[PDB]
């Protein structure tokens, strides 16, 4: 549409690969840096979607 659709999303970060036909869904933040993080997106860990 003219205004620009954004409803469709796709993951970028994940712990590892997934077996075929995986049907589970999370908004949890992904920790990429060595230091663990919790709560919202911060340094060394960003939203995987």
């Amino acid at each position: 549409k003219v205004s620009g659709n954004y409803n469709y999303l796709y993951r970028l970060f994940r712990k590892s690969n997934l077996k075929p036909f995986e049907r589970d869904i999370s908004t949890e933040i992904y920790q990429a840096g060595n230091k663990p993080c919790n709560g919202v997106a911060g340094f060394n860990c960003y939203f995987p979607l």
């Epitope: 549409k1 205004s3 620009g4 659709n5 954004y6 999303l9 939203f47 979607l49």
Partner: antibody
């Protein structure tokens, strides 16, 4: 679709303004409010457009920063914070639901408005 | 200041037809449709003509709008008591990548 904005706010210049509009009887995840500046008896002016998911947003072309977005899905509320206030900021904030198409774009309705004096 | 050039004020007696013209650029008016908004004083703005060919919620069909080149004109045939309102042009712009808006034209009801 009813949008409830904050009341009249008076702020000293160079200070910060916190204003929020609420989502009622609707899917806040599938609804977005794109805030619009409105000077009384004057033309409208877009500020920004955000989405509740992930939190990605786009701000005014003229201002790289100036205004920061935030959205809480649990409270179904959108918060806008303005910094480096100037005398030209005496105007109203109107929010705006986003027409159709999972409600991420275009304008259909507006909140009662938030008049701010600087 | 507005990219879309609207007249600042206009007048009209009840019953007659008046046009309001807003002009912009080819990237936002020549490449995109214009959207006409109406706003009663003291109240939230509404949408009067969208896509230049339809009304969002069964709005009086007496209202009309036209687009040509880099110009747009709202024509209303049926002036009435509470038609006093601010009317605005809105259109997406690729150069600014945002919705550029008009300066707003006040349509009044003459005695």
């Amino acid at each position: 679709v009813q949008l409830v904005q904050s009341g009249a706010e008076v702020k000293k210049p160079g200070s910060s303004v916190k204003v929020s509009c609420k989502a009622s009887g609707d899917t806040f995840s599938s609804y977005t409010f794109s805030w619009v500046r409105q000077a009384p008896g004057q033309g409208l002016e877009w500020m920004g457009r955000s989405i509740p998911i992930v939190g990605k947003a786009i701000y005014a072309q003229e201002f790289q920063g100036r205004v920061t977005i935030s959205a809480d899905r649990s409270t179904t509320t959108v918060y806008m914070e303005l910094s480096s206030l100037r005398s030209d900021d005496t105007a109203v904030y109107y929010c705006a639901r986003d027409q159709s198409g999972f409600d991420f774009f275009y304008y259909d309705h507006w909140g009662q408005g938030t008049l701010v004096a600087v | 200041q507005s990219v879309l050039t609207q007249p600042p004020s206009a007048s009209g007696t009840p019953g007659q037809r008046v046009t309001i013209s807003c002009s912009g650029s080819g990237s936002n008016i020549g490449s995109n449709t214009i959207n006409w908004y109406q706003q009663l004083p003291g109240t939230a703005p509404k949408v009067l003509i969208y896509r230049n060919n339809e009304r969002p919620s069964g709005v009086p069909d007496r209202f009309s709008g036209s687009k040509s080149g880099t110009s747009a004109s709202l024509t209303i045939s049926g002036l009435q008591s509470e038609d006093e309102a601010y009317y605005h042009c809105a259109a997406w712009d690729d150069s600014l990548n945002g919705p550029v808006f008009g300066g707003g034209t006040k349509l009044t009801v003459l005695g």
